[PDB]
């Protein structure tokens, strides 16, 4: 809504294309962009789940 | 950076400004916006009649 | 107007939603459930410009 913004990362279609994100060199960006899809935990949240 | 968009339903209409990222979006329109309307409590004999 | 795009809640003042995501203009006519909007890249404009 007005005066609020969000960042969305979308992979390709499929369950082989599940992102695992790690930021290297910076600690704040890693605090904001960090997801481990293998363990399904991270700083980002998953809106849409991957399917075949 | 030019793309074209299409919609399954005819109720929703979609157009693409330059810079869009290709993908698929799932859209649920919960509500619709409406504009306030105010009507005089009484009724008048004719327009030419002076009100004030 | 209240809608939901890919699991993100959007609230606007009018029935022309523009910045969800940035670069796609949606015209809402009536309430919808699980509509699909597909955006695919087209290169016709660049090839016409190059040919001319």
> Residue B15, Cα to own-chain centre: how many angstroms?
14
Provide the shortest C-alpha distance from residue A44 to chain B (in Å). 19
**Apex CA B15: angle with CA B29 and CA C35, to 5°?**
30
Q: Is the peptide bond before C21 cis (omega within 30 degrees of 0)?
A: yes
- Residue with token string 């990222």: B21
Report the residue of A3, A5, A8 to disrupt the C interface, i.e. the one with the largest count of C CBs within 10 Å. A8
> Residue B36, Cα to own-chain centre: how many angstroms?
14
Q: What would the two tokens of residue C34 be?
A: 């699980």
Q: Are C17 and C25 in contact (CB under 8 A)?
A: yes
| A10 close to B (CB below 8 A) | yes
| C43 close to B (CB below 8 A) | yes
Q: What is the DSSP string of chain C?
A: -EEEETTEEEE-SSSEEEETTEEEEEE--S-EEEEEEEEEE--HHHHHHHH-
| C16 close to B (CB below 8 A) | no
Q: What would the two tokens of residue A49 be?
A: 């789940």
Distance CA A36, CA C29 (A): 40
Distances (CA, A) of B4 to A12, A23, B23, B50: 18, 33, 11, 56
Experimental method: cryo-EM
């Amino acid at each position: 809504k007005e005066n609020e913004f969000q960042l969305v990362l979308t992979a390709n279609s499929g369950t082989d294309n599940t992102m695992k994100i790690t930021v290297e060199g910076d600690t704040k960006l890693n605090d904001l962009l960090a997801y481990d899809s293998t363990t399904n935990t991270g700083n980002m949240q998953e809106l849409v789940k991957a399917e075949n | 950076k030019s793309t074209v968009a299409s919609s399954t339903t005819e109720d929703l209409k979609v157009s693409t400004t330059a810079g869009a990222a290709a993908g698929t979006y799932k859209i649920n329109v919960t509500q619709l916006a409406a504009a306030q309307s105010l009507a005089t409590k009484t009724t008048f004999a004719t327009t030419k009649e002076q009100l004030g | 107007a209240k809608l939901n795009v890919n699991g993100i809640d959007i609230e606007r003042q009018s029935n022309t939603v523009t910045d969800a995501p940035q670069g796609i203009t949606l015209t809402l006519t009536k309430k919808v459930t699980d509509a699909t909007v597909t955006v695919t890249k087209d290169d016709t404009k660049a090839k016409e410009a190059i040919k001319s």
